[PDB]
Amino acid sequence: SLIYTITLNPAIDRLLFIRGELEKRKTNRVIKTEFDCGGKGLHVSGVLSKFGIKNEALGIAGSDNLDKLYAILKEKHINHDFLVEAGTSTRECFVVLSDDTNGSTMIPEAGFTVSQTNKDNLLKQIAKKVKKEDMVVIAGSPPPHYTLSDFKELLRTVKATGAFLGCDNSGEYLNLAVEMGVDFIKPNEDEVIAILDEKTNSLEENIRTLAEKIPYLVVSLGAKGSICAHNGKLYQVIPPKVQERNDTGAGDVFVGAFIAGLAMNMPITETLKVATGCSASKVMQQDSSSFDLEAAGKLKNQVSIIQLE
Amino acid sequence: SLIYTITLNPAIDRLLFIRGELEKRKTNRVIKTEFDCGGKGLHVSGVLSKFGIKNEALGIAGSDNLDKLYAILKEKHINHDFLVEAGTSTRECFVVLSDDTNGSTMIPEAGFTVSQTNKDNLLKQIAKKVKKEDMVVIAGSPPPHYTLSDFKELLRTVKATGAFLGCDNSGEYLNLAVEMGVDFIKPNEDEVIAILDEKTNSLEENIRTLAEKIPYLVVSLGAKGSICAHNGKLYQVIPPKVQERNDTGAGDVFVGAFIAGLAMNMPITETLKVATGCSASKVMQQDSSSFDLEAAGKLKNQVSIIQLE
Ligand SMILES: Nc1ncnc2c1ncn2[C@@H]1O[C@H](COP(=O)(O)OP(=O)(O)OP(=O)(O)O)[C@@H](O)[C@H]1O
Ligand SMILES: Nc1ncnc2c1ncn2[C@@H]1O[C@H](COP(=O)(O)OP(=O)(O)OP(=O)(O)O)[C@@H](O)[C@H]1O
Ligand SMILES: [Mg+2]
Ligand SMILES: [Mg+2]
Ligand SMILES: [Mg+2]
Ligand SMILES: [Mg+2]
Ligand SMILES: [Mg+2]
Ligand SMILES: [Mg+2]
C-alpha cells in the first residue's frame, strides 16, 4: 500500500527574510532567500516523508521551471510522478518574514490553466496507479479554470479505485467532497461554515450530524485544538500551550500526521495526539511547513483528549 | 562614439500586481506578473534605447538565470556585453503594486559576490572598449563586497580612457566620484547631503562651490524640479504639474534623457527641458521605469528654466 497526494495547483515558495515588519510603500531589503515547495498536497507529502512513510506526489506542474521544482522536492525527500503542462511555469508564492517578528505576509501567484489533455491524463494516471489498499489525499484549491465539474470527475475517479480518500479543501470543493462521499475532511473553524446547517446552531450537533456521512471528521480550531468524530464517538482534542511563531501550515502538518497515523493503524486517539503534537511543533517554527519531529514526539504526550458524551 | 552604462549590481524586477493596498500578515493574491530589468545602469540603457541613441550595457550578471535576464534586455532593446559570474544568479527585486493605488513596495535581494577575476575583467574590458569620444555612465550602488577601493579602481580606469564620465551614486561612492573628478552627477535632495559642506548653510552656495569640481552638476528636487550648475551658470528647472502615480525611477529617466541630450549636442537648457519632460512622464506611470516618449516631447515644452543670478 502507499499514500498518494494530489496537488492540482503546485507552487514554488520563495521565503524572503527581511528585518522587522514589512512596511508598504517602503524598501524592504532581503537578508536572505530560501525555497520550499508550495501547494497543500506537496506540504502533506513533505510531512509524510519526514515520518519515512511511503508516499508519492501527483499533480500538474509547469515545464519551464520543472528542474527547480524537482530540486526542491528532492531536498524535501518527496517522490513524485507529476504530469507536465508545456509552455507554462509552476506558480511562485512569495512569503515575506523576519527573524525579528512572528508574522508572515503571503503574496501568491494564481497558477496556470491546465489543458484538458492533462486533466484527462491525471484521471487515467490515478486509475492505473491507485489500488484499493492505498490512501489518497487531495489538498488545496484547484488552479484557475479547473471547474467544479472537473473536481467531481477527479473525486469520482478516486472513489472508483476503492482507496481511502481524504480531502482538505474549502468552499464549494469541500461541499462537493462531502456530498460525493469521502473518508476524511479537516475544515478549520472558518471553512467548516460551508458545510454547516444554518438552522442548527450547535457546533457539536452539526459535527455529529455531518459525522453520519464522513468516517473521519476533524474540525480544527487553531490554538484550541480540534474536535474529531469517528465511529459514533466525539473527541475534544486540546494541545499543550506552545510559544506560537507562525501558525501557517499547522493544518497541513496536522493532515500529514493524521494520515500517517491511520496508515500505521494507530487507534484514533493516538492518531489525534500525534497530529496535534506535530502541528503544535509547526506553530513554533518561523516558516510555513517545517516542524521538529523530536519536539512533536514529546508534545504528543502532553495532548489531552476527552470524549464528549 | 557610443554611450556605455555600467551596472555593477544588475537585477531582474518582478512586478507583482495585487488588488488595493499591500496588507502585511495577510494574503495578497497576485493578479498578474510582469518583468523588467533591474539595476540603475540598465534602466539608463533602457531610456537611451527608447531614444534610439547607440548604447551598450556593461556589468556583471549571474550565470544561472542569464537567459531570463537577456530575454528581458531584448524586450527593452538593450544591447549588452556583460561579464558572467559562474554559479550565481542575478538578484531579483520584487515590486508590489496595484492598478488601484499609487504606491509601490520594493523587496530587493542584495546581489552576489563578484569574483576578483571578474572585477579585473571589467577593468580590462573598459580599457579595450571605451574611447575618449565615448560617454560612460555608472549608476547604482555596488554589490556586496565590491569595496570603495574597487570602485576607485573602476573610476580611475574609466578616467584613463578620456571618456565623459557620469555617476549617479550615493554615500561614500558619490563622495569618491566627486573627489576623483567626474563630469556629471545627479544627487537627489537627500543624497546631496553626503557632499555638502555642513558649515555652508545655503544650498545654492554649496552647489556653486561644488560646481568648481563638476562640469555638469544636477541636484534633483523631486516635484520641485532641479537646480543645474554648468559653465558658471546656475539654472532653476521647474516641471509642469502632472498627476503623480509612481515617482520611482524618475531619476533614472532624468539621467538617461540628460545624457541623451548631451550626446546630441543639445544646449544645456534644452537638455534640461528634455530630461525634465521625460522624468515628468515617468512619474505619471505605474511601474518604476517606463515613460511615454509622446507625452514627454510635449511636457518638455512646458518646463520653465530660469537662470539664478
Ligand atoms: N497556537 C497553536 N498552539 C498549539 N497548536 C496549534 C496552534 N495553532 C494551530 N495548532 C494545531 O494545528 C492544527 C492545525 O490547525 P488550524 O485550525 O489553524 O488549521 P488551518 O487553519 O487549516 O491550517 P493551514 O494554515 O495549514 O491552512 C490545530 O487543530 C492545532 O492542533
Ligand atoms: N512629482 C513630480 N512631478 C514632476 N516631475 C517630477 C516629480 N518627481 C520627480 N520628477 C522629475 O524627475 C527628476 C528625477 O527626480 P528625484 O529627485 O525624485 O530623483 P531620484 O529620487 O534620484 O530618482 P530615482 O527614484 O530614480 O532614484 C526630478 O528632478 C523631476 O524633474
Ligand atoms: Mg494549494
Ligand atoms: Mg489556521
Ligand atoms: Mg487548512
Ligand atoms: Mg542598482
Ligand atoms: Mg525621488
Ligand atoms: Mg536616484
Start-to-end C-alpha separation, chain A: 35
- Long-range CB contacts (< 8 A, 24+ apart) of B82-86? B82/B10, B82/B57, B82/B58, B83/B58, B83/B59, B83/B118, B83/B121, B83/B122, B83/B125, B84/B60, B84/B118, B85/B60, B85/B61, B85/B112, B85/B114, B85/B115, B85/B118
Alpha-carbon distance B214 to B196, whole Å? 14
Cα atoms in the Cβ-side hemisphere of radius 13 Å centred on A295: 16
For residue A104, which residues of chain B lie inside 8 Å, CB to CB?
Answer: 25
Alpha-carbon distance A101 to A31, whole Å? 14
Specify the experimental method.
X-ray
Alpha-carbon distance A210 to A174, whole Å? 13
The residues near A33 (Cβ < 8 Å, ≥ 6 apart) are: A14, A15, A16, A17, B109
Structural gaps in chain B: residues followed by a C–N separation over 2.5 Å: none
Q: Could you give the dihedral angle defined by the CA atoms of residues B99, B100, B103 and B106, in that order, rounded to the nearest 10 degrees?
A: -50
Which residue in A17, A21, A25, A33 has the most chain B C-beta atoms within 10 A of its own C-beta, making it the best mutation to test that interface? A25
The answer to whether the CB of B164 falls within 8 A of the CB of B136 is yes
- Long-range CB contacts (< 8 A, 24+ apart) of B83-88? B83/B58, B83/B59, B83/B118, B83/B121, B83/B122, B83/B125, B84/B60, B84/B118, B85/B60, B85/B61, B85/B112, B85/B114, B85/B115, B85/B118, B87/B63, B88/B62, B88/B63, B88/B64, B88/B112, B88/B113
The answer to whether the CB of B133 falls within 8 A of the CB of B3 is no
The residues near B98 (Cβ < 8 Å, ≥ 6 apart) are: B17, B18, B19, B20, B21, B22
Exposure string of A227-261, with b = 16+ CB inside 10 Å and e = fewer, is bbbbeeebbbbbbeebeebbbbbbbbbbbbbbbbb
Exposure string of A1-23, with b = 16+ CB inside 10 Å and e = fewer, is ebbbbbbbbbbbbbbbbbeebbe
The burial class, CB within 10 Å (0-12 / 13-18 / 19+), for B94 is: buried
Alpha-carbon distance A69 to A78, whole Å? 11
For residue A16, which residues of chain B lie inside 8 Å, CB to CB?
Answer: 94, 107, 109
Question: Does A110 contact chain B (CB < 8 Å)?
Answer: yes
Tell me the structure's resolution in angstroms, rounded to a single decimal: 1.6
3-class secondary structure for chain A? CCEEEEECCCEEEEEEEECCCCCCCCECCECEEEEEEECHHHHHHHHHHHHCCCEEEEEEEECCCHHHHHHHHHHCCCCECCEEECCCCCEEEEEEEECCCCCCEEEEECCCCCCHHHHHHHHHHHHHHCCCCCEEEEECCCCCCCCHHHHHHHHHHHHHHCCEEEEECCHHHHHHHHHHCCCEECCECCHHHHHCCCCCCCHHHHHHHHCCCCCEEEEECHHHCEEEEECCEEEEEECCCCCCCCCCCHHHHHHHHHHHHHHCCCCHHHHHHHHHHHHHHHHCCCCCCCCCHHHHHHHHHHCEEEECC
The answer to whether the CB of B234 falls within 8 A of the CB of B205 is no
Report CA(A144)–ligand 1 centroid distance (Å). Answer: 27
Alpha-carbon distance A298 to A139, whole Å? 27
- Sorted by where each starts, the structural domains of chain A and their CATH numbers stand as 1-309 (3.40.1190.20)
Report CA(B246)–ligand 7 centroid distance (Å). Answer: 10
Ligand 2 close to Cβ of residue B226 (< 6 A): yes
Residue contact A18–B105, C-beta within 8 A: no
For chain B, what's the residue count? 309
Question: Is B222 marked within a binding site?
Answer: yes
Q: Which amino acid is at A220?
A: S
Q: How many other CB atoms sit within 10 Å of the CB of residue B133?
A: 11
Q: Which amino acid is at B161?
A: T
The answer to whether the CB of A110 falls within 8 A of the CB of A141 is no
The answer to whether the CB of B288 falls within 8 A of the CB of B253 is no
Q: Which of A167, A185, A203, A279 to mutate to test the pocket of ligand 1 (most atoms within 8 A of CB)?
A: A279
Q: Look at strands A216-220 and A226-230 and give their pairing.
A: antiparallel
The answer to whether the CB of B53 falls within 8 A of the CB of B38 is no
The answer to whether the CB of B142 falls within 8 A of the CB of B150 is yes
Which residue, chain included where needed, has cell 545627479? B186
Which residue, chain included where needed, has cell 555600467? B6
Report CA(B42)–ligand 2 centroid distance (Å). Answer: 18
Residue of A38, A41, A69, A10 lying closest to A288 (CA atoms): A38
Which residue, chain included where needed, has cell 511555469? A89
Ligand 5 ion: residues within 5 Å (CB):
A 251
B121: left (phi over 0), alpha (psi -120 to 50) or beta: alpha
The answer to whether the CB of A15 falls within 8 A of the CB of B94 is no
